[PDB]
Design a protein around this ligand. Structure first.
Ligand SMILES: Nc1ncnc2c1ncn2[C@@H]1O[C@H](CSCC[C@H](N)C(=O)O)[C@@H](O)[C@H]1O
Ligand SMILES: [Zn+2]
Lengths: 106, 328, 95, 79, 175, 51, 52
C-alpha cells in the first residue's frame, strides 16, 4: 500500500525518508519530517512552475526553454532574494539599459 | 521620387483615404491577395469597392520607371468574386461581418446585428424562392424580407423605409423602431418562403447619386478598387412609391399577412437580417422549390478558356466607360 | 550606418534578447587544456565538463562588467575604464 | 604556450555588450584577460584536486560543479 | 431658506460622487500591470477643471504605461440610437471613437476612466498598441505626476460644448 | 424585367447570362463561318430558365 | 498572332474588336433590349470584309 496518497501530496515521501535516513543528517527522526519536506518541496516547485508556464505561453511556445525559467526567477523579487548567488545554464540575462544612457533629439 | 508610394499609402487627396477599415468579422471574400477580381465591404454603410471588370490608367506619375499599365495592361484569368446566373444574395452590397461558405449557401452573422442584401432586381416573373433557417439561437433576431440598396446595411431591418422586416420572435411586426403585436414567431428549422408578387412588368427609379468625389479610382497598395458608393440623406428624400409595393414575409407558402406596406421604389434585394451568431441556407431564383432551373449558380471557378473569355468580357465591359469617361 | 552610438544600442538590445554563448569552442578548450597542463600532465577532459566551466566564466565576467558600468555612472561619464575594474574588484570584497 | 590571446577582441566586445556598455577604452583588454585567468586557475585548482583524489585521471563535469559550489558560486542544470 | 427658490435646478447627473473635499521590456507580457498594479496610483476626487476627475496620490514619470481604457465597443450604426438616448437621459458625448467604424460607448458599460476631462493644457497624450491580436489603448506619460493633480489628455480635435479650464492656452473649446 | 426594376447592366449580368456569354465567347475566339444559326439555336435553347 | 507574349488577352479584347463592342454595350445599357444579337450582327457585317 502507498504512502503519498495519505496526505494527498504528489512528491514521494518514502523516498525522502529513506534518503534522509541514509543521509546521516542525524541518528533518529520523527514521522512528520518526510511528509513535511515533501509538502514544502511541492509548494516551491509549484511556485516556480506556474511562472514557468506563464512565460511559456508568453511567447506562444509549448515547450519551456530554460530562458523562460531564467526570466521567471529573475523578474520576481522574493526569488531573487532567495536565489541570490545562483546562475542557470544557458539562462541568459534579462534586458536592461541604464537610464542616463538613452540618447534623444528633436 | 519615392513619395508617390507614401502618398498612396497615407490616403492622398483623391476623396476617401487609402486605408481600409472593415473591423467586424469579414470573411467569404477577398480570396486572391493580388490585383485580381476583389471586393472590400467597408465600415461605412454604402461603400462598395470592387476590382473585377479591370481598367488601364495613365502611366508616368512622377517620371519614374514606365508602369506596365501604360497601354497594355497585364491579363488576368482566375477566380472572380461574384455570380451571374442568379446571385445567391450578393458579394458587393454587403456588411463586413457576415460569414458565407465558399459555394455561398450559408450565412453566419456577427456578435451584433448584421444583414446581407442581393444584387438581382425583380420586375416581372415568378420568384417564389425560400430561405431555410438552419438554426436560430436565443437572442438572435432572424427577420427576413426584401429591402433596397439605399438601406443602411447595419440599420435594423425595418428601421428605414428602404428595409422591410417581420420579427422572428413572437411575430411582433417592427418598422422604424415601431412595434405592433401582429403574428406568431418563427425560428429553428423554419423555412421562410418569399415570393415578391410582381409577375407583371413594373416601373421604378434606380439611381440618383448625390456625391462624386467619394466615387474615385486609385491604387490602394498594389491593386485598384472601384469606389461605387451609395448615399443616404439625399436618397431618403427621393423616396417614392411603386407598383406591387408590398414586401410579404411568407412562411413557405402560408402567409401571416404582409406586415408593412408602401415599400421603397427601386431595385429590390432580399435582405436577410441576423442579430447574433446564426447560420441560414438560401435558395433564390426564378423557380419554385428546386434550385436547378437555370444554371445552378455558377461560381466561375475554372482554368479553361471560358474563364479567360468571361474575364476579358468583364474587362471590356468596364473598359468602354473608363475610355469614354476621361480621367481627372 | 553613421551617427556613432546609434548602432551600439541596436547591437546591445539584439544581443540582450539572444541567449547563446560568446566564446569560440576550440580556443577556450585549448586554453583550459594549457592551464590544466600547468597543474598536472595528461588529463582527459569530459566534453560536458569544459562547457560547464565556459558558462560559469561568462556569468562571473558579465556581472563584473555591470558593476563597472554603474561605477562609471558615478564618475559623470559613459566610457568605462580599467581603474573602475579595480574599483569593483576591491569593493566587492574579493581581492 | 601562449593562448590567452585566444580570447579575441570581438568576443570580449560582445560580452561587454552583455554587460550594458557601449563606450569602452582600448586599453581594458589586458586586465580582463588577467582576471579571467585568475578565475580559471582558482577553479581548476579545486577541480584537479577533486579529480585526483578519486584516483581517476579523467576530469568529469559533476566535480566541476562541486568545486563551483564550494567556492561560493553555484551552477544549475549540469548534473 | 425653505421660502426662497434657489436656481440651478436641472442637473442630468449620473455618477453621484461630487464632493467639496476631493482630499487627494518587450510589449506583450506587460498585461499584468494593467489589472493588478494599477489601482493605487490614482484616486477619484472632485476635479477643478469641470465635474469629477481622477486626482493623484502617487507619482509616475515619463514613458510609463499607466491605464487601459475599456468600454462597450459598438459599431457606428448604434451611434444614432445612442445619441438619441443621450439626448433623452441627459447623457454627455461619451462617443469614444477609437475609429470611424468602432466607437466605445460608456453609458451602459464602462471603466473607471470615464471620469476624465479635456483641456488645451493637458498632462498626457494617447497611444494605442496591439497585444495578442487585439488593439488596446494604453497611455504613456511624458512628464512626472505630482501628488494632487488630475490626469487629462488632449483630444486633438481639429479647429457647442465649451472647454472651461481657465488655462491661458485653453482654447475654451474642444478644438 | 429589363426596363426599370432590373438595371440594364444588372439585367445583362443577371438574367440572360448563358446566352450572350457563349455567343460573345464563340465570336471572340472561335468565330464559325456561319454563326447566325449557332446564335439562333443558343437563344432558343434558353426558354424556360429565366424570366 | 493572338495572345502569346505581345498583346495580353484582356488588352487584346480591349484593342481588337472595339468599334463593335462599344456600340453593343451602349445599346444594351440604354436601349435595354432582351435580344441585342441583331445589333451586334449588323455592326459585325459593316466591317465583315474590313477586318484587318
Ligand atoms: N471640461 C469639459 N467641459 C465640458 N465638457 C467636457 C469637458 N471635458 C470633457 N468633456 C466632455 O465630456 C465627455 C465625457 S463625460 C465627462 C466625464 C465625467 N462625466 C466627469 O464628471 O468628469 C467627453 O465626451 C467630453 O467631450
Ligand atoms: Zn482654459
Amino acid at each position: 500500500k502507498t504512502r503519498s496518497s495519505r496526505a494527498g501530496l504528489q512528491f514521494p515521501v518514502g523516498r525522502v525518508h529513506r534518503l534522509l535516513r541514509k543521509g546521516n543528517y542525524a541518528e533518529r527522526v520523527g514521522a512528520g519530517a518526510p511528509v513535511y519536506l515533501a509538502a514544502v518541496l511541492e509548494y516551491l516547485t509549484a511556485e516556480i512552475l506556474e511562472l514557468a508556464g506563464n512565460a511559456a505561453r508568453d511567447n506562444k511556445k509549448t515547450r519551456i526553454i530554460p530562458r523562460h525559467l531564467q526570466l521567471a526567477v529573475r523578474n520576481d523579487e522574493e526569488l531573487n532574494k532567495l536565489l541570490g548567488r545562483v546562475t542557470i545554464a544557458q539562462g541568459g540575462v534579462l534586458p536592461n539599459i541604464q537610464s542616463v544612457l538613452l540618447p534623444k533629439k528633436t | 521620387g519615392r513619395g508617390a508610394k507614401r502618398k498612396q499609402q497615407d490616403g492622398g487627396t483623391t476623396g476617401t483615404t487609402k486605408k481600409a477599415r472593415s473591423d467586424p468579422l469579414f470573411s467569404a471574400q477577398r480570396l486572391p491577395p493580388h490585383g485580381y477580381p476583389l471586393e472590400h465591404p467597408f465600415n461605412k454603410d454604402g461603400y462598395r469597392y470592387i476590382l473585377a471588370e479591370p481598367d488601364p490608367h495613365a502611366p508616368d506619375p512622377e517620371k519614374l520607371e514606365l508602369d506596365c499599365w501604360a497601354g497594355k495592361p497585364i491579363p488576368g484569368d482566375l477566380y472572380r468574386a461574384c455570380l451571374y446566373e442568379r446571385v445567391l444574395l450578393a458579394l458587393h452590397d454587403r456588411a463586413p461581418q457576415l460569414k458565407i461558405s465558399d459555394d455561398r449557401l450559408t450565412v453566419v452573422g456577427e456578435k451584433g446585428y448584421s444583414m446581407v442584401r442581393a444584387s438581382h432586381g425583380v420586375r416581372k416573373g415568378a420568384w417564389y424562392f425560400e430561405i431555410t433557417v438552419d438554426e436560430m439561437p436565443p437572442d438572435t433576431a432572424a427577420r427576413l424580407g426584401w429591402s433596397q440598396p439605399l438601406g443602411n446595411l447595419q440599420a435594423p431591418l425595418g428601421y428605414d423605409k428602404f428595409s422591410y422586416s417581420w420579427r422572428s420572435k413572437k411575430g411582433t411586426k417592427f418598422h422604424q423602431s415601431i412595434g405592433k403585436h401582429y403574428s406568431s414567431g418563427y425560428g429553428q428549422g423554419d423555412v421562410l418562403g418569399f415570393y415578391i408578387n410582381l409577375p407583371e412588368d413594373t416601373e421604378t427609379a434606380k439611381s440618383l447619386p448625390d456625391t462624386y468625389k467619394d466615387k474615385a479610382l486609385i491604387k490602394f497598395k498594389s491593386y485598384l478598387y472601384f469606389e461605387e458608393k451609395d448615399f443616404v440623406d439625399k436618397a431618403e428624400k427621393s423616396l417614392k412609391q411603386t407598383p406591387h409595393s408590398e414586401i410579404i414575409f411568407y412562411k413557405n407558402g402560408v402567409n401571416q399577412g404582409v406586415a408593412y406596406k408602401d415599400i421603397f421604389e427601386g431595385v429590390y434585394f432580399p435582405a436577410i437580417s441576423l442579430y447574433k451568431s446564426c447560420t441560414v441556407s438560401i435558395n433564390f431564383g426564378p423557380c419554385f422549390k428546386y434550385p436547378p432551373k437555370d444554371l445552378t449558380y455558377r461560381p466561375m471557378s475554372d482554368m479553361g478558356w471560358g474563364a479567360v473569355v468571361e474575364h476579358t468580357l468583364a474587362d471590356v465591359l468596364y473598359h468602354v466607360e473608363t475610355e469614354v469617361d476621361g480621367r481627372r | 550606418r553613421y551617427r556613432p552610438g546609434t548602432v551600439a544600442l541596436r547591437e546591445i538590445r539584439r544581443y540582450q534578447k539572444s541567449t547563446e554563448l560568446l566564446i569560440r569552442k576550440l580556443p577556450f578548450q585549448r586554453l583550459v587544456r594549457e592551464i590544466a597542463q600547468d597543474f598536472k600532465t595528461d588529463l582527459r577532459f569530459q566534453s560536458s565538463a569544459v562547457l560547464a566551466l565556459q558558462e560559469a566564466s561568462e556569468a562571473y565576467l558579465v556581472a563584473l562588467f555591470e558593476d563597472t558600468n554603474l561605477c562609471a555612472i558615478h564618475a559623470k561619464r559613459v566610457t568605462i575604464l580599467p581603474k573602475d575594474i579595480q574599483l569593483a574588484r576591491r569593493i566587492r570584497g574579493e581581492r | 604556450r601562449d593562448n590567452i590571446q585566444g580570447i579575441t577582441k570581438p568576443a570580449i566586445r560582445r560580452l561587454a555588450r552583455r554587460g550594458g556598455v557601449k563606450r569602452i577604452s582600448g586599453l581594458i583588454y589586458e586586465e580582463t584577460r588577467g582576471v579571467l585567468k585568475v578565475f580559471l586557475e582558482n577553479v581548476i585548482r579545486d577541480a584537479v584536486t577533486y579529480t585526483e583524489h578519486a584516483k581517476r585521471k579523467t576530469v568529469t563535469a559533476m566535480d566541476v560543479v562541486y568545486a563551483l559550489k564550494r567556492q561560493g558560486r553555484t551552477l544549475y542544470g549540469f548534473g | 431658506a425653505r421660502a426662497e427658490v434657489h436656481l440651478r435646478k436641472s442637473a442630468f447627473d449620473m455618477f453621484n460622487f461630487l464632493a467639496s473635499k476631493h482630499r487627494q521590456l518587450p510589449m506583450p507580457m506587460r498585461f499584468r500591470h494593467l489589472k493588478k498594479t494599477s489601482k493605487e496610483a490614482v484616486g477619484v476626487y472632485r476635479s477643478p477643471i469641470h465635474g469629477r476627475g481622477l486626482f493623484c496620490k502617487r507619482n509616475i514619470d515619463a514613458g510609463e504605461m499607466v491605464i487601459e481604457y475599456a468600454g462597450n465597443v459598438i459599431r457606428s450604426i448604434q451611434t444614432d440610437k445612442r445619441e438619441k438616448y443621450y439626448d433623452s437621459k441627459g447623457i454627455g458625448c461619451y462617443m469614444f471613437r477609437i475609429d470611424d467604424s468602432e466607437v466605445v460607448d460608456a453609458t451602459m458599460h464602462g471603466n473607471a476612466a470615464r471620469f476624465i476631462n479635456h483641456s488645451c493644457e493637458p498632462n498626457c497624450y494617447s497611444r494605442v498598441i496591439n497585444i495578442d491580436g487585439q488593439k488596446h489603448i494604453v497611455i504613456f506619460a511624458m512628464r512626472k505626476i505630482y501628488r494632487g493633480e488630475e490626469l487629462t489628455y488632449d483630444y486633438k480635435f481639429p479647429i457647442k460644448l465649451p472647454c472651461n479650464c481657465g488655462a491661458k492656452k485653453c482654447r475654451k473649446f474642444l478644438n | 424585367v429589363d426596363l426599370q426594376s432590373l438595371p440594364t447592366r444588372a439585367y445583362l449580368d443577371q438574367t440572360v447570362v448563358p446566352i450572350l456569354l457563349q455567343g460573345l465567347a464563340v465570336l471572340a475566339k472561335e468565330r464559325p463561318p456561319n454563326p447566325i444559326e449557332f446564335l439562333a439555336s443558343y437563344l432558343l435553347k434558353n426558354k424556360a430558365q429565366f424570366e
